[PDB]
Structure formats: C-alpha cells, structure tokens
Write a protein that binds this ligand. Sequence first.
Ligand SMILES: OC[C@H]1O[C@H](OC[C@H]2CCCNC2)[C@@H](n2cc(-c3ccccc3)nn2)[C@@H](O)[C@@H]1O
Ligand SMILES: [Ca+2]
Ligand SMILES: [Ca+2]
Ligand SMILES: [Ca+2]
Length: 132
Amino acid sequence: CHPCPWEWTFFQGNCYFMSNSQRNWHDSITACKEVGAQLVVIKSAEEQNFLQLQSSRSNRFTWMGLSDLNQEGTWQWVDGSPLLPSFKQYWNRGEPNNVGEEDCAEFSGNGWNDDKCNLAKFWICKKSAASC
Ligand SMILES: OC[C@H]1O[C@H](OC[C@H]2CCCNC2)[C@@H](n2cc(-c3ccccc3)nn2)[C@@H](O)[C@@H]1O
Ligand SMILES: [Ca+2]
Ligand SMILES: [Ca+2]
Ligand SMILES: [Ca+2]
C-alpha cells in the first residue's frame, strides 16, 4: 500500500501532480477529472505555500482551480467554494487586473495572477491520499 499514485507528491493527506504539458484552463479541468482528481483547490495557507514553492522553483506558469468566470471580480474555486479574504494576500502586486479579460487564476512568480483562460499553461491536479 502507498498513499499516492506513482509520480504524485504526498502532502498533508492529499496527492498532487504537476503536468509536463500545457493546456488551457477548461482542458486542464478535464485533464484532472480523467485521472480521478480536481484542478487544484487550495484550502489552507500551508497548502498555498507548498504549491507556490513548486511553481516558483520549476519556473512554470501553472493553472489552479479558481476563476471569476461566473461573476467578474468574485473568485470561486471549481468545487464551488468562495475565495476567502484570508487568501487575497497571494495575488501578485497589481493583481487581479483583468487586462484584456482575464478570468482564470495561475501561479506566477511569487504569487497569483489572473490570465486569459484560453492560454495554454501547466496545471496541478489534487486528490486525496489512500490510507495505509
Ligand atoms: O497580459 C498577461 C499578464 O502580463 C503580465 O504578467 C506576466 C505574464 C507572464 C506570462 C504568464 N502570465 C503572466 C501582467 N500584466 C500585464 C499588464 C499590463 C497592464 C496594462 C497594459 C498592458 C499590460 N500588467 N500586468 C499580468 O497582469 C497579465 O495578466
Ligand atoms: Ca470576466
Ligand atoms: Ca476577471
Ligand atoms: Ca492579470
């Protein structure tokens, strides 16, 4: 028994996978569903730091499961949960700025950016670990 599939990273009871290819935001959602996972929904500050460190180290602009597609300026996770005020700190300086209509969130440098959902980026999937 092992908690996560091969090539997935265990962190605090969940399993994470960073892609090696690039897709747009909606196709990244589909990619995670196909492996029994979800485009990453962040639930804690420690989880944010863990994910941001990997995006920063790898120098990969990476989608997360967050959008303001339903209501411009109101950010919602793909599981329906709202972006809480304790997470506004992670936006990069000047973000979100919706320049040229940007409705999907990415890890970019040290924080988050809103970018065009049609752009191809890396993505991270998350699913719960098995108990061994
Ligand atoms: O336009 C894509 C992103 O360009 C920059 O971010 C860098 C990219 C690098 C590739 C991965 N995504 C992040 C940031 N930017 C653009 C502008 C801006 C403002 C007014 C007029 C013209 C441009 N201000 N800031 C982000 O806000 C943008 O979303
Ligand atoms: Ca919009
Ligand atoms: Ca927007
Ligand atoms: Ca932006």
